Amino acid sequence: IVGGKVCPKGECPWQVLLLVNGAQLCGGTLINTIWVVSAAHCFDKIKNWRNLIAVLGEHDLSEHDGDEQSRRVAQVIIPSTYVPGTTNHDIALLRLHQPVVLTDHVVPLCLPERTFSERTLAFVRFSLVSGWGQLLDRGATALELMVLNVPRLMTQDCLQQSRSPNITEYMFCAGYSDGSKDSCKGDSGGPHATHYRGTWYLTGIVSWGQGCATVGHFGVYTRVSQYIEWLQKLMRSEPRPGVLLRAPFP
Amino acid sequence: LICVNENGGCEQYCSDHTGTKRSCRCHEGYSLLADGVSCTPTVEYPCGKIPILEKRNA
Numbered sequence: 001i002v003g004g005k006v007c008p009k010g011e012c013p014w015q016v017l018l019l020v021n022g023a024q025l026c027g028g029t030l031i032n033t034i035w036v037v038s039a040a041h042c043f044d045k046i047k048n049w050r051n052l053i054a055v056l057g058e059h060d061l062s063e064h065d066g067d068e069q070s071r072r073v074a075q076v077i078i079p080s081t082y083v084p085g086t087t088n089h090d091i092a093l094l095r096l097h098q099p100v101v102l103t104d105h106v107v108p109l110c111l112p113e114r115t116f117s118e119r120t121l122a123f124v125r126f127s128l129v130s131g132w133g134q135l136l137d138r139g140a141t142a143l144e145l146m147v148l149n150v151p152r153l154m155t156q157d158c159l160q161q162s163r164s165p166n167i168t169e170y171m172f173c174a175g176y177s178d179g180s181k182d183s184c185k186g187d188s189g190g191p192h193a194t195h196y197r198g199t200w201y202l203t204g205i206v207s208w209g210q211g212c213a214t215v216g217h218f219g220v221y222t223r224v225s226q227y228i229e230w231l232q233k234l235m236r237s238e239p240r241p242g243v244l245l246r247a248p249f250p
Numbered sequence: 251l252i253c254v255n256e257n258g259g260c261e262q263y264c265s266d267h268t269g270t271k272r273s274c275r276c277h278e279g280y281s282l283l284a285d286g287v288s289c290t291p292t293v294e295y296p297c298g299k300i301p302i303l304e305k306r307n308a
């Protein structure tokens with residue numbers, strides 16, 4: 001995250017850290033005790049699918065304070081329409097091997113109904129994006145979880161204001177074009193969380209952008225509203241052997 | 251009332267029904283109050299609420 005602030009410990013309790021052989025991979029969002037939403041592109045280069053770990057309740061990567069909970073990732077589910085090396089359909093649903101325990105520091109973000117998300121949440125101007133990604137373009141990643149308030153653009157306005165992948169109906173733009181504030185590499189997969197009448201909801205996944213905080217460009221987010229029914233059906237399904245699962249979309 | 255305008259007055263989810271009818275609904279871990287619009291937690295850690303902040307103003 002560029003130009004944000006430290007998320008006070010426990011104020012981003014849905015944030016997930018994904019590790020591969022102990023190394024930072026990506027962010028994610030807890031939506032239930034066994035389910036995490038992340039970005040499909042995070043998994044393009046995974047060689048050993050059995051060494052993926054999700055950490056909940058993380059805050060400061062330099063220390064162990066006892067609020068962290070680690071789980072093996074049992075399943076990574078990606079839409080059939082996602083193509084490795086590209087940006088469209090950038091979503092993954094992760095099943096944890098055992099539930100996390102909900103605590104003051106570990107709480108799911110609400111996965112909204114589609115209608116609600118499209119008709120109401122899509123018009124809330126500002127939402128929060130968070131992660132342990134790079135603090136600057138070409139810079140070091142953060143040791144403490146960072147958070148940033150970003151405004152959402154209608155896609156017509158993003159294309160107009162921006163000056164190369166298309167912005168598809170499975171994406172939306174958010175952020176600033178003045179080079180000051182943005183999500184960045186290493187924040188991929190993390191939440192774009194939207195507040196409405198006292199409750200927070202998952203509306204986007206940190207997906208891509210032209211550099212980070214690049215003048216004339218905005219961050220691009222996976223438009224989670226397009227995937228609600230796809231996610232809900234998968235969460236009702238039995239697990240299948242083998243970590244990676246490609247599931248038909250729609 | 252209609253779900254497209256002002257979320258049908260619902261705090262959370264809204265369904266339109268035949269005639270001038272509307273039903274609000276709440277996420278798992280919440281219940282709908284008698285006002286027909288408000289949702290109140292039914293569990294200790296409902297989704298989308300931040301415990302340290304909910305305790306700070308309780």
Ligand SMILES: CS(=O)(=O)N(CC(N)=O)c1cccc(CC(=O)Nc2ccc3nc(N)[nH]c3c2)c1
Binds near residue numbers: 044184186210219
């Ligand atoms: C090139 S590829 O399509 O092949 N692929 C590689 C791969 N094989 O995974 C890939 C796909 C999507 C994103 C990325 C990196 C990326 O853009 N991160 C990022 C995240 C958030 C951001 N916010 C801003 N403002 N910029 C951001 C940048 C790589």
Ligand SMILES: [Ca+2]
Binds near residue numbers: 058060061065068
């Ligand atoms: Ca820690």
Ligand SMILES: [Cl-]
Binds near residue numbers: 236237238
């Ligand atoms: Cl099934």
Ligand SMILES: [Cl-]
Binds near residue numbers: 050244
């Ligand atoms: Cl496997």
